[PDB]
Amino acid sequence: DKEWILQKIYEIMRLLDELXDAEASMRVSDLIYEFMKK
Amino acid sequence: DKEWILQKIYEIMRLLDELXDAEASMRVSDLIYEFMKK
Amino acid sequence: DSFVIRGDEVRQIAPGQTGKIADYNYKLPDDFTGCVIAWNSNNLDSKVG
């Protein structure tokens, strides 16, 4: 479930964006980028 | 490989347990068990 | 040039990687010694909203 991995992780990213971390959202999105790319 | 990714999910669960989301921590933890397994 | 780089992406000046928008063109190929003078944009590059 690599695509379900992407699913869970971008749900994490959307919730991070809503919580207002901004910081966490941006570079954990860097994490997800280097996750789905690699 | 998948080591870096599951370590990413480790960092994610650590960020969660530092934030304060008991529900979300249990979610990502059970998903981590079902991601090491499946 | 001057573009607001992400935090660590000041270090993504290294070949082969996918960038946030350097996906289009950037990412040092063979012998691009493109001079860069960088710093923390944290003076004003963060806005209410």
Side-chain angles (χ1 to χ4, degrees), chain A residues 1 3-4 6-38, chain B residues 1 3-4 6-38, chain C:
Chain A
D1 286 332
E3 195 176 5
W4 195 242
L6 183 153
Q7 213 74 15
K8 175 196 183 189
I9 297 169
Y10 185 60
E11 296 297 340
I12 302 314
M13 181 43 54
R14 167 167 290 280
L15 74 85
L16 278 171
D17 171 48
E18 310 323 313
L19 185 43
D21 286 332
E23 302 287 318
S25 176
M26 287 304 156
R27 287 201 202 165
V28 175
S29 199
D30 184 20
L31 197 78
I32 315 177
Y33 268 49
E34 303 178 25
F35 153 81
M36 61 79 69
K37 286 291 175 185
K38 37 190 59 181
Chain B
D1 272 297
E3 291 193 32
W4 203 38
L6 57 86
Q7 197 56 220
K8 294 180 168 211
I9 323 296
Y10 169 91
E11 303 169 6
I12 296 164
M13 82 94 72
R14 285 306 162 84
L15 164 65
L16 274 188
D17 62 56
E18 201 266 336
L19 288 154
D21 218 345
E23 279 66 26
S25 159
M26 290 185 180
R27 266 170 187 152
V28 293
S29 88
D30 283 322
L31 268 296
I32 279 188
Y33 287 160
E34 303 201 6
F35 210 90
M36 299 168 171
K37 185 75 174 182
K38 306 162 188 172
Chain C
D1 197 346
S2 171
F3 36 73
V4 175
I5 195 62
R6 273 203 149 193
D8 46 331
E9 285 222 350
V10 61
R11 307 276 55 75
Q12 287 195 1
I13 293 92
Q17 168 55 27
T18 288
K20 305 296 181 185
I21 289 299
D23 203 330
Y24 279 151
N25 301 272
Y26 199 49
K27 213 48 58 145
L28 296 182
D30 46 16
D31 203 86
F32 281 181
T33 73
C35 296
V36 294
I37 313 298
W39 61 98
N40 61 269
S41 47
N42 203 24
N43 47 21
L44 275 300
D45 268 324
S46 311
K47 281 296 161 289
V48 182

